[PDB]
Design a protein around this ligand. Structure first.
Ligand SMILES: CC(=O)N[C@@H]1[C@@H](O)[C@H](O[C@@H]2O[C@H](CO)[C@@H](O[C@@H]3O[C@H](CO)[C@@H](O)[C@H](O)[C@H]3NC(C)=O)[C@H](O)[C@H]2N)[C@@H](CO)O[C@H]1O
Ligand SMILES: [Zn+2]
Length: 403
């Protein structure tokens, strides 16, 4: 038996430093989840990205999961007209989390255009089992969560309308949050309706002190960081974390799917000797040590696509157990042994659809007070039922009422 499961996640690649992080993981057989922005493939990301596409292939060919972090990390929302140099301009002012989300519908279509750009550089990318770019996402700067119908969170302080949190006068206020944070929540609901899950994080391997001249140099030591991981296990880390920017407000603490797991967040550019410090010189052995000793401490590493386990012939499932089957979440209705001829489906009596989306869907267990969207209209659930073809919201005056 294992102590728990760590999910190593790496934001904001593929950059030339993705290559070196991958080789450290590959030396120890650990596989990681990589949330990628494809503008590094167009070389407009203002980093070292000569080998970005080489990095993307190395990740896929050595079995790491690739996931959708949007095309340009919402840098169009920081400049006034997004173009080649926008990545460089926005690094001058450092106004990244300021007005990070504005038009939710445009911002969300940035995840769509991400996929179009990947498939253009790696035209055979859909043939990799590891490519989850259509199904797994993470919002820039936001500790947001869309996991199941009953497992969602939101980062209510992750972005700002005016000031940075280290500037005098920054007041957060979860009761009326920033228009940027409001926009970020709409983006998640849009992605959820497209069939995505989104994962935030339990722990952040990041600078303890971003203000420092070389902020990559202040990365937590591995031994100490194993301490933050042991700290975070079953302790509902996303609400207790610091700063209040990276908090996941509304995290369903105690939820069963999160038990015995820790999602670690890091950035590849923290592992590069360069503009942010001695990243490779100081932190690549940090990461190597963390794998050796976290294994010793009793952990097993995995990738986010298994956080929600895949339905498997031969496993015993209990009522209320969550699985994934074709990138769609289901909750067991009936304890049973899963056999090949009754996998989850839109008509299974053994399973109900539990995707965190909000359009009306077949085989969902609706509670009263739920709202669904159907043929462009919003209906409210008057009576708890499991939906089926005959009960479309626009024909069942009893079950649904139009808003
Ligand atoms: C500690 C704190 O006050 N806030 C934490 C955030 O720092 C952090 O979110 C991360 O912020 C980074 C700084 O903005 C940001 O890096 C930027 O990313 C873009 C895209 O790669 C680059 O163009 C910028 O150069 C880069 N900025 C810098 C200074 O390197 C990260 O993308 C973003 N995730 C989160 C997670 O650590 O936690 C907050 O609490
Ligand atoms: Zn990011």
């Amino acid at each position: 038996a294992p102590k728990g499961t760590i999910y190593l996640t790496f934001d904001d690649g593929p950059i030339n430093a993705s290559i070196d992080v991958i080789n450290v993981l590959n030396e120890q057989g650990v596989k990681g989840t990589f949330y990628f922005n494809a503008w590094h493939l167009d070389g407009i990301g203002d980093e070292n990205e000569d080998r970005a596409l080489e990095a993307l292939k190395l990740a896929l060919d050595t079995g790491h999961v690739v996931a959708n972090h949007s095309y340009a990390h919402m840098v169009h929302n920081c400049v006034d007209e997004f173009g080649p140099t926008s990545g460089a301009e926005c690094n001058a002012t450092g106004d990244h989390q300021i007005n990070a989300y504005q038009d939710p519908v445009y911002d969300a279509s940035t995840f769509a255009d991400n996929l179009v750009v990947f498939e253009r550089y790696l035209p055979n990318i859909n043939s990799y089992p590891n490519y989850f770019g259509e199904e797994l996402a993470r919002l820039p700067y936001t500790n947001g969560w869309r996991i199941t119908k009953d497992f969602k969170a939101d980062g209510l302080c992750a972005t700002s309308d005016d000031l940075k949190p280290w500037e005098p006068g920054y007041v957060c206020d979860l009761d009326n949050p920033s228009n940027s944070v409001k926009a970020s929540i709409e983006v998640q609901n849009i992605l959820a309706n497209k069939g995505y899950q989104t994962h935030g994080w339990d722990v952040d391997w990041s600078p303890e002190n971003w203000g420092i001249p070389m902020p990559a140099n202040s990365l937590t030591e591995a031994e100490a960081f194993l301490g933050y991981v042991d700290a975070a296990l079953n302790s509902c880390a996303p609400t207790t974390i610091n700063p209040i920017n990276s908090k996941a407000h509304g995290f369903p603490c105690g939820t069963p799917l999160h038990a015995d797991k820790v999602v670690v967040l890091t950035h590849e550019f923290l592992y590069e000797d360069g503009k942010r410090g001695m990243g490779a010189t100081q932190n690549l052995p940090k990461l190597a040590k963390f794998l050796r000793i976290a294994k010793e401490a009793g952990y097993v590493f995995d990738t986010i696509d298994n956080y929600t386990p895949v339905w498997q012939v031969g496993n015993a499932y209990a009522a209320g157990d969550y699985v994934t089957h074709s990138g769609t979440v289901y909750k067991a209705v009936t304890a049973h042994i899963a056999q090949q001829d009754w996998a989850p489906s839109s008509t299974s009596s053994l399973w109900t659809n539990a995707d965190p989306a909000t359009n009306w869907t077949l085989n969902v267990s609706y509670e009263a007070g739920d709202v669904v969207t159907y043929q462009g209209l919003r209906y409210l659930v008057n009576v708890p039922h499991v939906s089926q073809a005959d009960w479309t919201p626009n024909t069942q005056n009893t079950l649904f009422t139009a808003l």
